[PDB]
Design a protein around this ligand. Sequence first.
Ligand SMILES: Nc1ncnc2c1ncn2[C@@H]1O[C@H](COP(=O)(O)OP(=O)(O)OP(=O)(O)O)[C@@H](O)[C@H]1O
Ligand SMILES: Nc1ncnc2c1ncn2[C@@H]1O[C@H](COP(=O)(O)OP(=O)(O)OP(=O)(O)O)[C@@H](O)[C@H]1O
Ligand SMILES: [Mg+2]
Ligand SMILES: [Mg+2]
Lengths: 584, 584
Amino acid sequence: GAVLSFHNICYRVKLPVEKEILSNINGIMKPGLNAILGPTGGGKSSLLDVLAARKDPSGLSGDVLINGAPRPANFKCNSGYVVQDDVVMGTLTVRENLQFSAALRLATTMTNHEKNERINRVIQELGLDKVADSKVGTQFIRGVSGGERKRTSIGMELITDPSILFLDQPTTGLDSSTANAVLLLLKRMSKQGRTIIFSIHQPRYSIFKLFDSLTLLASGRLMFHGPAQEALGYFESAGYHCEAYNNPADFFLDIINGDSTAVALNREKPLIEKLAEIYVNSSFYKETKAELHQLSISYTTSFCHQLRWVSKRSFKNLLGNPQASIAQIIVTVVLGLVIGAIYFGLKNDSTGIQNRAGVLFFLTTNQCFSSVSAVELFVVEKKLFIHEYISGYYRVSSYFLGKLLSDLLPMRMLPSIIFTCIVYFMLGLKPKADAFFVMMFTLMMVAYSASSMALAIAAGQSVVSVATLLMTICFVFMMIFSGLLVNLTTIASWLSWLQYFSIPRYGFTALQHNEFLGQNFCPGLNATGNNPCNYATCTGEEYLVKQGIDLSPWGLWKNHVALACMIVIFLTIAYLKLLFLKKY
Amino acid sequence: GAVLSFHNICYRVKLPVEKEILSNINGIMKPGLNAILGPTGGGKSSLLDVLAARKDPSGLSGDVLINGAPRPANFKCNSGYVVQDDVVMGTLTVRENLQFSAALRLATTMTNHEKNERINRVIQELGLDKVADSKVGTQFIRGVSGGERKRTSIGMELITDPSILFLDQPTTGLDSSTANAVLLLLKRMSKQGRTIIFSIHQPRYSIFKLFDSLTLLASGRLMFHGPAQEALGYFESAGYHCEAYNNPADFFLDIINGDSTAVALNREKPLIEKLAEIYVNSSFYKETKAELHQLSISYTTSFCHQLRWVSKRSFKNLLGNPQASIAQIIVTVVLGLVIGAIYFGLKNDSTGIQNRAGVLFFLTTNQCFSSVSAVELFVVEKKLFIHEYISGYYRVSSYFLGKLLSDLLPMRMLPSIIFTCIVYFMLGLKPKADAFFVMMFTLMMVAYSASSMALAIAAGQSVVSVATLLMTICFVFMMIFSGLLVNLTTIASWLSWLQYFSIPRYGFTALQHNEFLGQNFCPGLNATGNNPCNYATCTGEEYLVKQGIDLSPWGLWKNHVALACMIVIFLTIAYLKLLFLKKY
Ligand SMILES: Nc1ncnc2c1ncn2[C@@H]1O[C@H](COP(=O)(O)OP(=O)(O)OP(=O)(O)O)[C@@H](O)[C@H]1O
Ligand SMILES: Nc1ncnc2c1ncn2[C@@H]1O[C@H](COP(=O)(O)OP(=O)(O)OP(=O)(O)O)[C@@H](O)[C@H]1O
Ligand SMILES: [Mg+2]
Ligand SMILES: [Mg+2]
């Protein structure tokens, strides 16, 4: 079994001014069933986060050790923490959330059939039968109830078979018969050699009789720590006799909460500093401090198994909530039909270039501004990514690449195919076969580079408010330097370097080089030369040298390697912004 | 006192296929302390939502009556419902959330000093002293703990002094000494004549002795309803003897949950249809059905008091989280400085018009695309608006106008002032005093009309992903018809009507009429006329004739009344999309 030890644990929270949650706290949690009791605000979820390695260590002032050695790197992949506020995906099902966490947190030497045989056993043992194929709700569509969602969070961290299991009040939201059935399941599990540390509120006497160790937190200090059977006899010596209460857990928390002003105002030298100084002078503290001195990432599944399940769960959210993908395809058709109907029948005339160089500007501007909706990719599921990363589900690189494919394929690749096809059979652009696919590839790369910039601004962010705003004003900034309204050669030298940062300038140049190269506009001529007066812009090549565009075949693909270097750079910024996010 | 009565209550939920949550349920809840016990998934939050008029009545199949009459329209402003999942604003404080709900749900005949004197009494009685001036947390920054946030939700619906109070498990998350101190506060409150209906999980024996009425739900049916003192003696006649349990609430839920598969698998003709048929033949059902047959918006504060508190709370969120407003002002300065540095020193030349008509296009394009960030104004607080509307805090029109002023002033009015000023002392536009303020007013109206369109697409929506996408592609659509790249007069008649829907076409026309009227460009002339050739475009009036812009003073303000009619229409769509939102 695992003997988790914690020695001289202090904590501090900056609100600046620091507040001392969790003063000097010492204890040992041997394999069994270790309960933490105490009032609300006592520091029970703070102690249980320190012990589960989920607090920022800048405020933490002690050492937690498993078996006398410090915590390994594969601790989240060997332990479980059921947290208090039930971070469950509410577009999946009770069985689907159990299928996801069994797939990524159990090793793949087990069959997918035998993984589901263990999911059925946990659904039966937790009593989730009538809601197993019913959706966990979100905060707008109700679904599964609060106690049935609580048992889903318990069961997701229970198929994984952890050796140390932490539970943040596992039976609040449960009734007195399901709460006893859950701790009798844990007591059965704890007798296989598991260390189970939990906090609990209002346990009944049949639940309290299961405890192997008792911890009593109040105001951040320890009122008692030791066995639960020798807990009632500890308070008899301190002047508190038991049986005005048939339940000892109702007796223990009437002592350590008598100083509370709710209890003093309703039906009724500090009590905390008196009860805490009794404990450090007692024999239970000398027993544990003379025992503490004797004691004093390699994920479960591979990268490709986690990549094939983050994207599998991401595609099921898009096939269940296909609002933004149907609306993407709908307003891409009616925009491609309108752009094709305005510039319908492009002539080779004196005004056939500003129609052509004005239609390829609105194709590029559309693919850039459509990518502002990629800001919400890592923002709406930030709480679920942070919870499931510290729980040991996946790498950051598995989640990052798996969630890319739910934004790359259905929102950027596919609406750049049907947008290129629609404005090709109705405009009359360069009619060859290769220039159709160069135009399709160019519209994809400005959709990928502008989406990678949407991820680089918005990764690791809680709201979309700063990121959408910096997304659109950076695209108005990149549209000044696109090379259409104001000429890039007449820009002064201290500002003309900003044209190399412009995503629309690379797309519009590659669309201009693909379209105008080999065209001729001056035919229709007289015995005299042509008879407009700029004088004339006959060849598509001389239009390109006026813009400053190279006529070599490198002058086309210079713009496609500069958009590929903007995809790699902006997706490395966006990856590291999720990697170095503070997830405590 | 209020005698709430519910008769033949049924419910149904479409998952399509219908599921019968809450079968035939009858009962009476007289002034006192009425508890609802039962297992998880029994239908306790569904009965407590039916009774509080928070369920969609398309599935509801009975009648709930207060004092034998149907409930009035001012029921949410006379009752209180503490819901289960603690919808609290986490950027405010425990005292600030209590100050907000006392200001909008207590009448203003009470002084603001005496409202805060009652807030201090509720903070003392609930034991919220050490966290009263500490922030309730969000899901990313922890703050107040789970039980201390639970008591904030209780206290917000308790300063209001409701006559009927519903509580959705008010003591889950509380410990056994604060849970007793909360129900002793309710028992003191219930003896003034209040009807207090609650559901409860795992009550101790001192809490169970406070109940005046007991209701036992299991799988949607009623296992018992009547007094709580005569509840133990009801199950003695049905074959269940009590004292293997010293707590009767632990005895009642071991009967009605013995059919649960968690209890059958752990330490161990249907039981529900056997226990439900015993009750309908009992004397407690004949007593209540022969008593049920004998029985069978005007907000608290005014519109202006609610408008001055929704905006007061909205400004405190912007002064506490000023990320998107500082970033708005920063990238408006460096964009106005870049636009002013590219077109620096606008000259009156042959190419001084496409510099001028190209700089007023990027000023209009910026004010439209900056307004995409107005999409999440009503989206990120949709759960808090829906909760606080059905709780009777404000009207929709109070919240709508109060939340406009947190998006109108700091994000659209102020960044259109400093954007107009910056590109005026460095460009050299129309140098009069009135044309500076016409240019400032024009940039404000395209920022208001484009933000009102951001609200019209995004009001009543849970994600910003569809609405940001339809925002930016509608602005690319409106930029084709702005009248710069493709000429509006050469557009065919079946497509040229779409130029009247274009917000940038109205702003850019009013910016062109303000700028070019009275300018002259052909000076610098010879003995010959000018000697470039298209031929020339000398006066600014003949440039405006070529664009198709009226030269009358109405031709300027035609564009400002068409943007004002787009503000009124898009803010009426956005208001009605919050008004007719299904908030059940
Ligand atoms: N990061 C933090 N910021 C502000 N306050 C904190 C923070 N962490 C802890 N606290 C405070 O410390 C006290 C204990 O916190 P904790 O969340 O551990 O309580 P708890 O014992 O779990 O209470 P409950 O049982 O009601 O959930 C609380 O009163 C809380 O307000
Ligand atoms: N809108 C809904 N969609 C799907 N299922 C529902 C819906 N409403 C109720 N249910 C189901 O009905 C049962 C009872 O729902 P309810 O939320 O009332 O449970 P409860 O008694 O409050 O449970 P708990 O005490 O655990 O919160 C639950 O099992 C839930 O799955
Ligand atoms: Mg807690
Ligand atoms: Mg409930």
